[PDB]
Each structure stands twice: as structure tokens, then as C-alpha cells.
Symmetry: C3
């Protein structure tokens, strides 16, 4: 079942990528860069999850580590944060320093998750905690300085940014929650339960987010 | 013999790098970035192939030799070659870094599928190989489609040079996955020594040959 | 003791990062990018050294592989910081900056490979890293210093100071490497551990204190 779920996921990622490509052909004022980002996220996640489906992107450590998830997130999650940052900056001057601040925090976050998964006892929760601290700083930037950039770009953009910021932030907190509850953490949730959460969540983050984000930006277009 | 061939290759890479450096000292209107790219490609490839020569950049897997240092080489050298080709198309005009990074992304993915395919067995090997070939087809479509149209937007003389270097590189591109599939990593029709010689001779034309043709053609545009 | 030293180091890195963040809040004409670089260097090094403290970032000769994970990010960022100092108040030369980044990343990789190697092979890789370092030094005191000079007497004086500071530390690393267990094995493991605790405090925090203070002073 776990293999089949991952095959299904990869197919949905492909469909998402194709939808974003078709959107890119009639871009409605959204720069090509934002369509490229929207396409890379699901295609990369799709490839990573395909490796799990084929029984390659996981190994035994007694307990199963789905290491292909970290290979996925270390690329897909910084790209999602870049997408969010470019949305805030839409129609205005770019702040690439702030964008790369978020990328740096996020990459660190995913690495702490991988190391935590390879760790046991207190060490696991030290790494997990450092990842959570990274996430809190990302949230502070998202609803603080990055939102202030969004506000500087007008009422309609700021309203859209706030919506996609809440959307992504809601999903963000779900990942480390599922991680902690599942076999990698406290082991309250069964393996199959965790697998389903990390199949369903990413559909909303790797395709859902970009549908909402691109549609909202496209709606701002005159003509 | 395999060791000696790799020592020889690394020395040729060094000579190529030095030639591009000397060219960079009298640049004839070619930006320093294009000389840097031209130098990094052979130096990186040279280092990777030196590791094979020293007997480090290979190991035994499925009773076959995996020259993993080739993938370490290509994952850096091949995206840089595509960047060189993309900057040639954009020479004397506005840059399209979105298209450039599209090619970089496709190419890095392509090399990764090759590494995973080499580590795989049976149907799984050819699933990864196939995804890499799909990436290459999209690269070729970009190269002779939208990227060539950028070249044409920069005038007859530039477009003529771009088309020449695009054909040169494209011809070499298709050879790599052909040799891969025919050799021990794939169907095993071609002998290991034959594959070794192909992956010594081809790269001399791509790591040095391409940049000689590319830089000379761009330099000729100078008055 | 080795564990305790690494915990202490990671705490100093955290304090350094916090200081640079506080400085960033009243930037005095220094772009946010230079404060971001100053913060990433110690935080990344701190994380890597924490992994050694926890007994994870090494395998047993003992290879402290977490040092290479540290340097492959921290050292290119230090060179970027130095390059941006040279270019302060003038046009950026990102080609020269990325030239230094490329040389430096290659340099650290040769160090890791050399550490995993034995005999003549080890010293071939070590030698390639040294050649990379020499080219970095030639760029630092040649073309990069020329950019600094083009940006006025006060900037050039500050650049020259931080260039000598960083260059002094640079040459120490491959010297200690060669003398220690990774190389000739003349220096004891504990001695090498202390050197690679003390040196980095001066490079990951010291350099940016001197660098940022000097640039901030140009606001007046
Ligand atoms: C794109 C991401 C790729 C996932 C990595 C694939 C796993 C490596 C193969 C392991 C194996 O064959 O046992
Ligand atoms: C990974 C490490 C991150 C450190 C990198 C430095 C930030 C570079 C951003 C360049 C900023 C350009 C101008 C701007 O838009 O702010
Ligand atoms: C691989 C790269 C890893 C990067 C290093 C990991 C930790 C990085 C964190 C630095 C980012 C902190 C920036 C906070 C201040 C932002 C602001 O001024 O608004
Ligand atoms: C500041 C916030 C950083 C810390 C955040 C999360 C802490 C959660 C870790 C607790 C799990 C311990 C369980 C256990 O030890 O069995
Ligand atoms: C613990 C959970 C913390 C997460 C959310 C913090 C929200 C921050 C709100 C804006 C503060 C940033 C600012 O205004 O500069
Ligand atoms: C992990 C693998 C990552 C490899 C990526 C490295 C290769 C990418 C190079 C991109 C170069 C693009 C630089 C644009 C030059 C702009 C200019 O010349 O003005
Ligand atoms: C520059 C890139 C060069 C990379 C080469 C990696 C070679 C690593 C060899 C490790 C030693 C293996 C062995 O001798 O068993
Ligand atoms: C396989 C993973 C590789 C992913 C690396 C690249 C992902 C693409 C992300 C961003 C694209 C950058 C576009 C830069 C826009 C500059 C403006 C322009 O000239 O078009
Ligand atoms: C594979 C062969 C490449 C085909 C090139 C088609 C050109 C596309 C276009 O004109 O947009
Ligand atoms: C022209 C192609 C060169 C290679 C042809 C000979 C193949 C040798 C072999 O079967 O191993
Ligand atoms: C060296 C390997 C390949 C040779 C490539 C072409 C030879 C030089 C031609 C120069 C030119 O076309 O101006
Ligand atoms: C963030 C920087 C961290 C990098 C080093 C992490 C090393 C983790 C290895 C764990 C292996 C083990 O538990 O034995
Ligand atoms: C391997 C990873 C290497 C990471 C180090 C690279 C970062 C270089 C940062 C250069 C930023 C320059 C732009 C600054 C500005 O324009 O303000
Ligand atoms: C690995 C790195 C290989 C070299 C990659 C190329 C990056 C060059 C960046 C070009 C910036 C042009 C603008 C400038 O020179 O200021
Ligand atoms: C250690 C020895 C290595 C070299 C130090 C710097 C060499 C001289 C710098 C370049 C001088 C110049 O270009 O004018
Ligand atoms: C400072 C004091 C120096 C302590 C002694 C140094 C020993 C180096 C040789 C191992
Ligand atoms: C012009 C449109 C280009 C589309 C290419 C999309 C890039 C995807 C990269 C693959 C990553 C997996
Ligand atoms: C053992 C499988 C390794 C696959 C390589 C995936 C790409 C590197 C990690 C993300 C960058
Ligand atoms: C450790 C793996 C490295 C992760 C990096 C993945 C790429 C994310 C960087 C996003 C950059 C896009 C922003 C460009 C601005 C467009 C104008
Ligand atoms: C990932 C570990 C980071 C440790 C802290 C780094 C130093 C302080 C960073 C604070 C950033 C605050 C950004 C929001 C400003 C309002
Ligand atoms: C034992 C099976 C239970 C599966 C539960 C899946 C829950 C998915 C909800 C997504 C958030
Ligand atoms: C997979 C979740 C998709 C959510 C998209 C919502 C519909 C578009 C809103 C505009
Ligand atoms: C992978 C190896 C990286 C090496 C980069 C090549 C750098 C050579 C020096 C660049 C030339 C700049 C000199 C300007 C004066
Ligand atoms: C090995 C067996 C794999 C069977 C499923 C292949 C599906 C490929 C989709 C791309
Ligand atoms: C690497 C696998 C990619 C899967 C499909 C990606 C989405 C479609 C890409 C279309 C190619 C664009 C070429 C431009 C033609 C003009
Ligand atoms: C003018 C139309 C462009 C199509 C070019 C055909 C594809 C080139 C073949 C590449 C293989 C060598
Ligand atoms: C005017 C000089 C101010 C120096 C402040 C030093 C702060 C050091 C931060 C922690 C380093 C360990
Ligand atoms: C047997 C001992 C050989 C040691 C080699 C050390 C020399 C490496 C190059 C030094 C550059 C100055
Ligand atoms: C501590 C190492 C210092 C190396 C540089 C010394 C030579 C610099 C030459 C500059 C020319 C003026
Ligand atoms: C490995 C330890 C060697 C002792 C120190 C060598 C010189 C470095 C500067 C102090
Ligand atoms: C110069 C950089 C600092 C040097 C510190 C040397 C400490 C050596 C202590 C050795 C004690 C016995 C192993
Ligand atoms: Na070019």
C-alpha cells in the first residue's frame, strides 16, 4: 500500500506540473520565474516520492527512515519560501537578502530533521528543537518584515499574500507535528498513519499552494 | 591503461583551463563570467577524472564497476556548459536567467537520474534512464526552440555562431546516454574498455572543444 | 574534554551571531547582505561543531568530517564577506567573488578527499588544495586589493587590515592539517582539536567583528 500511495502521489505531482506549465503559456502578468518555481517543486517532490515507491528512497535504522523525504524538502521547501517571498515583492523592488535569509533558515531546518531522524534519545530532540527554532524565525519573518513588503505593494497584493502566508504557515506547523507524533519521534502514530499524512499534506503544499498563489497573482492582471 | 588514460585526460583539462585563462587576459568584448565558466568546466572534470586515475572515483556494484566520479563531474560541468550556451544566445541582448536556470535544473536532474539508474537493477534502472532522456529531449527543445529565438533576437551574426555551438554540443549530448545504455551500466553490449575510451574522448570535445569554438566565435564579433 | 570544548565553541558562535544581528538593527550604511553573511558563518559552524560535541560529526585515525561540512559553507562566505569589503562604495565584481567561492569550495573538498586518502594520494589532494589557497591569496593581495584601492584610502586601509587578518588564519589551517593526525602525525590529536577550536573563533566571529566595525566607521 505504501508503494502504491507513492506512485499515486508522483502522478498527481506530474499533473500539477503540467497545469502550471499550461498556465505559464498565458502568464497574465506573472513573471516566468514564478511559473518555473511552481513547476520544479512538484516535479522534484514527484521524483523523490517515485524513489520511495520503487523501494530505493528508504532504509532500516529496526525503524524505517524515508530519507527521500529530506532530499525532496531540502529543494522543494526553500523554493516554496522563494515563491511566498516573490509574492510579497510582486509589483515592487525585490529584497533578495530577505529571500536568501528564508532559504538559509529553511535548508538548515530540513537538515536538522534528517540528523534528528538519524539520532536517538536527547540528541534527536536537540536537532528537532533547532529545526523548530528555525521555523519560528521563518514565521516571524513571514508575518513581520515580509508582510510589511507585501503591504508596501498595495491592498490587493497584501490581501493575497496574507491568504497564501496563512495557507503555507498552517501546513508548515503540520510537518514537525506529524514528525514528532510518528515513528521518527514519540511513536504514538502508526507507520501507515504517518505515511498517509506525508502523502496528503504535500499535495496541498506542492500543488495546492501554487494553484492558490498563481491564481491570486493572475487575478491582479489588467486586461 | 584505464589509469594512464585518466592521467592524460586531467593534463589536457589543465592545458585547456590555462588556454582559457590566457584568452581571458585579452578578452575582446567577452565578459569575465564566460571565461570563468570556460575555466571551471575543465578544472572540475580534470579533478574528478584524476580521482579515477588514482583508483578512488570508482567502486564495484552488481559485479560491475561504477565510475561515480563521472556523475560528480557532470553534475557541475554539464549545467555550466548549458549556462555557457545560454549566455551565447543572450550575447549583446537582455539576459533570460529564468530560461538559463530552467536548463540548469533539467540538466542536474538528468545527471542525478543517470547516477540512480547506475545504482539500480532491472526495470527500475530503465525508469530512471528514461526520466533522464525525457529531461535531455526538453533541453534539446529549449536549445533549438526558445533559446535559438533569443539568439535570433540578437542579430544574424550572433545567431549564426549560436546555431553552430548548439549543433556541436547537441551532437555530443546524445552520445552520452547512447554509450551509457550500450555499455556495462545498461544493456552491456559494449566492453568496459570501449566505454572508458568513449568517456575519455567525448569530454575532450565538450570540456575544451566547445569553449574553444564558443569563445573564438564570440571574440570574432569584437572590433 | 573534546566534547566540552565543542559545546563551548558552539555557544560562542551563537553569541557572535546574536551580536551581528543586533548590529544589523542599526546598520550604519552597511547593506543587510553583509550582516546576513556575518550571521550565517558562525551559526553554520556552531551547528557543525555541536554535531562533534554530541559525538556524531566524526568517525574512527579519527576523521572530524563535520569540520569539512562547516568549512565548505563558512569559508566561501568569509571570502564573499572579504570581496564585498573590497567593493564597498563601488561597483561589484561578482565574477571575481564567485572565482574565490569556486577556488575555496574546491580547496575544502581536496582536504576531505586527502583525509580519506593514504600515502602519496593524500599529498596529491593536499597539494591541489594548497595551490587553490595560493591563487586565493594572489587574488586577495592583487586584483581584489586593486578594487579596494579604487574605493578610496579609508576603505583600502580597512580592506588591507581584514585581508592580512584572514590570510594569517588561512595559512594556519593547512599547516595544522599537515602536522596533525590527518597528515604527518607529528602533532597530537588533542593539540589539533584545540587549534581547530581556537583558530575558528578568530575567523568565524573575530573577522566579522573587525570587518563590520571598520565598514560601520566609514558611515562617519
Ligand atoms: C531525485 C531523487 C532521487 C532519490 C534517490 C534514489 C535512491 C538511490 C538508490 C538506492 C538503491 O538503489 O538502493
Ligand atoms: C546560503 C547563505 C546565504 C548568504 C548569502 C547572501 C545573500 C545574497 C543576496 C544578494 C542580495 C542582492 C540585493 C538584494 O536584493 O537585497
Ligand atoms: C546551507 C546553508 C545553511 C545556512 C545556515 C543555517 C542557519 C542560517 C540562518 C541565518 C538566517 C538568520 C537571519 C535572521 C535575520 C533576518 C532579518 O534581518 O530580517
Ligand atoms: C523554543 C522551542 C524549541 C523547542 C520545541 C519543541 C520541543 C519538543 C521536544 C519534546 C520531546 C521530548 C520527548 C521525549 O524526550 O521523550
Ligand atoms: C511560537 C510561535 C511563533 C509564531 C508566530 C509569530 C508571529 C509573529 C508576528 C509578527 C512579528 C514580526 C514583526 O512584526 O517584526
Ligand atoms: C548541486 C549541483 C549544482 C550545480 C550548479 C552550478 C552550475 C550553475 C551555474 C549557473 C551560472 C549562471 C551565471 C549567470 C552569469 C550572468 C552574467 O554573466 O552576467
Ligand atoms: C573534485 C572531485 C573529486 C572527487 C573524488 C572523490 C574520490 C573519493 C575517494 C575516497 C577514497 C576511496 C578509497 O580509496 O577506498
Ligand atoms: C533540480 C533542482 C534544481 C533547481 C535550481 C533552479 C530552480 C529555479 C529557481 C529559480 C529561478 C531563478 C530565476 C531568476 C530570475 C531573474 C530574472 C530573469 O532574468 O529571468
Ligand atoms: C529533440 C529535437 C529537438 C526539436 C526542437 C523543436 C523546436 C521547438 C520550437 O520551435 O519551439
Ligand atoms: C563509433 C563507435 C565506436 C565504438 C564501436 C565499437 C564497440 C566495441 C564494443 O563492442 O565493446
Ligand atoms: C581540443 C578538442 C577539440 C577541438 C575543437 C575545435 C578546434 C579548434 C577550432 C577553433 C575555432 O573554431 O576557431
Ligand atoms: C547543520 C550542520 C550539521 C552537520 C553534521 C551533522 C552530522 C550528523 C551525523 C549523525 C550520524 C550518527 O548519528 O552517527
Ligand atoms: C557551496 C555553497 C557556497 C555558499 C557561499 C556562497 C555565497 C556567496 C554570496 C555572494 C553574495 C553577493 C551579493 C551581495 C550584494 O549584492 O549585496
Ligand atoms: C561554481 C561557480 C562557477 C562560475 C559561475 C558563474 C557565476 C558568475 C556570476 C556572474 C555575475 C556577473 C556580474 C558581475 O560580474 O558583477
Ligand atoms: C603565501 C604566498 C602566496 C602569495 C601571496 C600573494 C602574492 C602576491 C599578490 C599579487 C600581487 C599583485 O598582483 O600585485
Ligand atoms: C600555548 C601553549 C602551547 C602548548 C604546547 C603545544 C604542543 C604542540 C605539539 C603537539
Ligand atoms: C520554458 C519552460 C521550461 C520548463 C522546464 C521546467 C523545469 C523542471 C526541472 C526539473 C526538475 C525535476
Ligand atoms: C543515495 C542517493 C543519492 C541521490 C542524490 C540526490 C541529490 C542530492 C541531494 C539533494 C541536493
Ligand atoms: C541545500 C540545497 C540548496 C537549496 C537551494 C534550492 C533553490 C532555492 C533558491 C531560490 C532562488 C530563487 C529566487 C530568484 C529570484 C527571482 C528574481
Ligand atoms: C536557526 C538558529 C538561529 C538562532 C538565532 C540567530 C540570531 C538571531 C536571529 C533573529 C532573527 C529575527 C528576524 C525577525 C526580525 C523582526
Ligand atoms: C491507520 C490509517 C489512518 C490514516 C489517517 C490519515 C489522516 C490524513 C489527514 C491529513 C492531515
Ligand atoms: C489540492 C488543494 C487545492 C486548493 C486550490 C483551491 C482552488 C483555487 C482557489 C483560487
Ligand atoms: C573547480 C575549480 C575552480 C577554479 C576556478 C578558476 C579560477 C581561476 C582564477 C580566475 C581568474 C581571475 C583573475 C582576474 C585578475
Ligand atoms: C520495478 C517495477 C516498477 C513498476 C512500476 C513502474 C512505474 C513507472 C512510472 C514512471
Ligand atoms: C523532467 C520531466 C519533465 C516532465 C514534464 C514537465 C512539464 C512540461 C515541460 C514542457 C517542455 C517545455 C519546452 C518549451 C517548448 C517551447
Ligand atoms: C529550425 C527547427 C529546429 C529543429 C532542430 C532539430 C533538432 C536537432 C537535433 C539534435 C541532435 C544532434
Ligand atoms: C566596540 C567593540 C564592541 C565589541 C563587542 C564584542 C561582542 C562579542 C560577541 C560574542 C563573541 C564571543
Ligand atoms: C611522506 C611525507 C610527504 C609529505 C608531503 C608534504 C608536501 C605537500 C605539499 C606542500 C606544499 C607547500
Ligand atoms: C599571512 C600571509 C600573507 C600573504 C601575503 C603577503 C604578500 C602580499 C603582497 C602584496 C603586494 C603589495
Ligand atoms: C595540528 C596542530 C599543529 C600545531 C599548530 C600548527 C601551526 C598553526 C598555527 C598555530
Ligand atoms: C595558534 C592557535 C592556538 C594554539 C593552541 C595550542 C594549544 C596546545 C595545547 C596542547 C596540550 C597537550 C595536548
Ligand atoms: Na557563452
Amino acid at each position: 500500500m505504501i508503494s502504491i500511495l507513492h506512485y499515486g502521489y508522483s502522478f498527481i505531482m506530474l499533473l500539477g506540473a503540467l497545469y502550471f506549465y499550461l498556465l505559464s503559456k498565458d502568464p497574465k502578468g506573472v513573471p516566468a520565474s514564478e511559473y518555473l518555481i511552481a513547476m520544479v517543486i512538484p516535479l522534484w517532490s514527484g521524483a523523490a516520492y517515485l524513489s520511495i515507491a520503487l523501494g530505493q528512497g528508504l532504509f532500516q535504522y529496526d525503524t524505517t527512515i524515508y530519507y527521500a523525504r529530506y532530499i525532496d524538502w531540502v529543494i522543494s521547501t526553500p523554493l516554496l519560501l522563494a515563491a511566498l517571498a516573490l509574492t510579497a515583492m510582486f509589483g515592487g523592488k525585490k529584497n533578495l537578502t530577505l529571500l536568501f535569509s528564508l532559504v538559509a533558515l529553511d535548508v538548515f531546518m530540513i537538515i536538522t530533521g534528517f540528523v534528528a531522524d538519524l539520532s536517538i534519545g536527547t540528541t534527536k530532540y536537540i536537532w528537532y528543537s533547532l529545526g523548530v527554532i528555525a521555523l519560528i524565525i521563518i514565521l516571524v519573518i513571514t508575518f513581520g518584515p515580509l508582510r510589511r513588503i507585501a503591504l508596501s505593494n498595495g491592498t490587493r497584493l497584501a490581501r493575497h499574500y496574507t491568504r497564501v502566508a496563512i495557507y503555507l504557515s498552517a501546513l508548515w506547523v503540520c510537518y514537525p507535528t506529524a514528525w514528532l507524533l510518528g515513528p521518527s519521534g514519540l511513536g504514538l502514530a502508526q507507520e501507515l498513519t504517518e505515511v498517509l499524512v506525508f502523502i496528503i499534506l504535500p499535495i496541498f503544499s506542492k500543488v495546492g499552494f501554487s494553484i492558490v498563489d498563481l491564481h491570486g497573482l493572475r487575478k491582479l492582471h489588467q486586461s
